[PDB]
């Protein structure tokens, strides 16, 4: 399945990339705050220009408000499994990660408040004409309070709590297809900082099995 038939004039039309062009590493201790700066900004300004080229009426100031709307509405589709609307809000790279693990689970998610306004941390563009397509990725930082309660196939509470809101600091990356006349801005992926605090524990206990040794084999620590 990796490649379609050979020597075929028709090719697969991809609408997104598989990864981030230049991964934005957030400064350590950014949660606490809740020369190189110019160099990164200049790279953003250059890339912003090629974004305003294809779409003249683009405003960086308006995006963080739009980014929040896309983010909230995308997560609300998970509550009612509105996959048809979700594809318009997220890319093909994000859609599997969001829905695959909850196919037979009930997700109750809600947006409570936004602690800090969203800030466009980085803006970058792809290499011109990868295969005739140019993409624009805008990394955004979100600090908001959310509530999540996941239930299993049998309606039993599996993760989180349904009424206790907790703080979330996550840098959502968006991506748009500039060349496409009908392309739009769509949640592309998420940056997980290495210093990010560990997620809340699950409810059930788990056992990690040891090595399954054949008779000839012997157990070595």
């Amino acid at each position: 399945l990796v490649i379609p038939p050979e020597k075929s004039d028709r090719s697969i039309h991809l609408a997104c990339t598989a990864g981030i062009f230049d991964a934005y590493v957030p400064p350590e201790g950014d949660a606490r705050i809740s020369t190189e700066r110019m160099k990164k900004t200049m790279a953003s300004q250059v890339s912003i220009r090629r974004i305003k080229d294809y779409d003249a009426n683009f405003k960086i100031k308006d995006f963080p408000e739009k980014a929040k709307d896309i983010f909230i509405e995308a997560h609300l589709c998970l509550n009612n499994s509105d996959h048809d609307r979700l594809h318009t809000l997220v890319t093909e790279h994000c859609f599997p990660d969001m829905t695959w693990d909850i196919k037979y689970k009930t997700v109750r998610w809600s947006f409570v408040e936004s602690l800090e306004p969203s800030h466009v941390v980085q803006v970058r563009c792809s290499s011109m004409m990868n295969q005739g397509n140019v993409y624009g990725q805008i990394t955004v930082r979100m600090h908001t309070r959310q509530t999540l309660a996941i239930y299993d196939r049998f309606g039993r509470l599996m993760y989180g709590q349904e009424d206790v809101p907790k703080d979330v600091l996550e840098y959502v990356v968006f991506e748009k297809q500039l060349t496409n006349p009908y392309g739009s801005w769509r949640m592309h992926t998420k940056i997980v900082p290495p210093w990010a605090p560990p997620k809340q524990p699950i409810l059930k206990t788990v056992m990690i099995p040891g090595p399954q040794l054949k008779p000839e084999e012997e157990y070595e620590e």
Binding site: Y104, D152, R153, F154, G155
Partner: protein, 166 residues
């Protein structure tokens, strides 16, 4: 053919209420087109009904029938699937709720007889179905005691009316 047994692990129940009793997990697994007789397979499926997952596995490991190895193979992958994909906490906290065999798609072959005569030989296949329910195995029914019979007999005497009159 029908493949309804595999679609029963896709039923998503609504979230339970705070005061409702915790619903036991139910796992449906089956193996299709086993080269073995359903009549012979029934005895092995009959053996482990109502048993705990660990007791059923022990009984099948020391059985000499060919179906025992196949059923043990099905029970193990069902046990793994229960904890991995169905949110079962303890792998040992499972019991055989249902276990039965079904007829598969079979093939016909010629069996030769003397005097130029023949018979039609069937190459038999079967299915095996198992349902695993979370929780301890339900206790067996205590033998009906003498007190129960005497109570039942007097009950029938007391429900006895004058028939064919006012």
């Amino acid at each position: 053919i029908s493949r309804k047994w595999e679609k029963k692990n896709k039923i998503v129940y609504p979230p339970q209420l705070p005061g409702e009793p915790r619903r036991p997990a139910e796992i449906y697994h089956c193996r299709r087109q086993i080269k073995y007789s359903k009549d012979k397979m029934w005895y092995l499926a009959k053996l482990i009904r109502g048993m705990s997952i660990d007791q059923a596995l022990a009984q099948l490991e020391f059985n000499d029938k060919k179906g025992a190895k196949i059923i043990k193979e099905v029970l193990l992958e069902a046990q793994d699937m229960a904890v991995r994909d169905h949110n079962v906490e303890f792998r040992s906290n499972l019991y055989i709720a249902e276990s039965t065999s079904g007829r598969g798609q079979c093939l016909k072959r010629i069996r030769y007889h003397g005097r130029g005569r023949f018979g039609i030989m069937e190459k038999v296949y079967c299915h095996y179905f198992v349902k695993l329910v979370e929780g301890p195995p339900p206790p067996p029914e205590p033998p009906k005691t003498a007190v129960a019979h005497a109570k039942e007999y007097i009950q029938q005497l007391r429900s006895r009316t004058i028939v064919h009159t006012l």
